[PDB]
From a paper:
Profilin is an ubiquitous cytoskeletal protein that interacts with several molecules, such as actin, proline-rich ligands, and phosphoinositides to perform several cellular functions. In this work, we focus on the study of two plant pan-allergens, profilins from the rubber tree (rHev b 8) and maize (rZea m 12), in their monomeric and dimeric forms. Here we isolated the monomeric and dimeric species of the recombinant profilin allergens rHev b 8 and rZea m 12 and obtained their crystallographic 3D structures.
When the protein concentration was increased to 10 mg/mL, only one crystal of rHev b 8 was obtained, which contained two molecules in the asymmetric unit, as indicated by a Matthews coefficient of 3.06 Å3/Da and solvent content of 59.9%. This crystal belonged to the space group P32 and diffracted to a 2.8 Å resolution. In this study, we determined the tridimensional structure of a dimeric rHev b 8 stabilized by a disulfide bridge and compared it with the structures of the monomeric forms of the same allergen and that of rZea m 12. In addition, there are several hydrophobic and polar interactions between residues of α-helix 3 at the C-terminus and α-helix 1 at the N-terminal region. From a functional point of view, the hydrophobic N- and C-terminal regions of the profilin structures are very important for their interaction with proline-rich proteins, such as kinases.
Numbering used by the authors:
A (entry chain A), B (entry chain B): 2 to 131
The structure:
Amino acid sequence: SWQAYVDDHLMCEIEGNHLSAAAIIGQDGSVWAQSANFPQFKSEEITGIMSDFHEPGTLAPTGLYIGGTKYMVIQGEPGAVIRGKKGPGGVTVKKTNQALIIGIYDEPMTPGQCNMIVERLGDYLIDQGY
Amino acid sequence: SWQAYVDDHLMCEIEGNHLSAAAIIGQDGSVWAQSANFPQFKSEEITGIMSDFHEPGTLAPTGLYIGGTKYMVIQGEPGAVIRGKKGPGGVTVKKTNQALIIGIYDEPMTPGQCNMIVERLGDYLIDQGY
């Protein structure tokens, strides 16, 4: 049950602070599970993302759009992780063999807190085949 | 705090499974936090651990005991992780710069579930200079 991957793991608490909206989306674009406050993702967004993964950098010019919100594209690992800031908040998106982990934090969560939670779980899924 | 990590982070279930016991522990030997059922480190136990970390392979023929319990060494990462096996149980020792992180699994929890959960936070604390 993906849902508990999203309820009891991405929402797990590190240094007393936990994510705001976690979701596990396929590359095609279909929500496997999402957090109660995870938004609904508008046009091209999962495919736009999917082509900063395929030829990197491409997203930063236009800017990270996720539920139509513009996130400042940050340093990310080519074709594996993409990151973004908006004030004291931002998002990590880890690429999997077949999915996209996605996790949204705000202050007091630190970016590298949100990366640890999100990014490792993907590496775990990239080994459970998905 | 430290008994925050252990009982909340390392005990965060995955796939419905969470560790038997976790501990963060000084490299000298001073426990910073440990779970409830976590054993009690005996004689020359930590010390051997940091040799196979510095001279890898050293502990393995001897075995590697933790609370005087027998873990047959399996393969890990030189000078980073020590993993060990006990039927449907076993243990991972993610070593940070001056500390160790340790988790103990008994199946329905997988080597890989443990593995990631311990190594997850281990690298993290190496980022916050531990």
